[PDB]
């Protein structure tokens, strides 16, 4: 929310909720540049 | 459940896709630092 929030918005449709060590990234493919989504999916693929 | 996908890249790195939304769960105590840093770099350039 607006007060005491662990959620940060980098851009519309791109937010991160911090939960200590764990974090949740919400990415809206209708709003976040496709290039950004692909770069992130590429990084995740490498982890595999 | 036919309206989404769930995938695990490594322990502590899983994603849920539903509609236009991509929800990535990252456990930084289990996912390599390099990986987390490259993702953060991408988000910041977006800012």
From Swiss-Prot, chain A:
Signal peptide: none annotated. It comes from the Bacteria. Belongs to the ParB family. Control of plasmid partitioning; required to recognize the cis-acting. Binds specifically with the DNA segment containing the sopC region. SopB is trans-acting. Overproduction of SopB protein causes IncG incompatibility. This is Protein SopB. It comes from Escherichia coli (strain K12). The chain holds residues 276 to 319 of 323 of the full protein.
């Amino acid at each position: 929310g607006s007060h005491m929030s662990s959620r940060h918005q980098f851009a519309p449709g791109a937010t991160v909720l911090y939960k200590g060590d764990k974090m949740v990234l919400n990415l809206d493919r209708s709003r976040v540049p496709t290039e950004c989504i692909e770069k992130i999916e590429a990084i995740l693929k490498e982890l595999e």
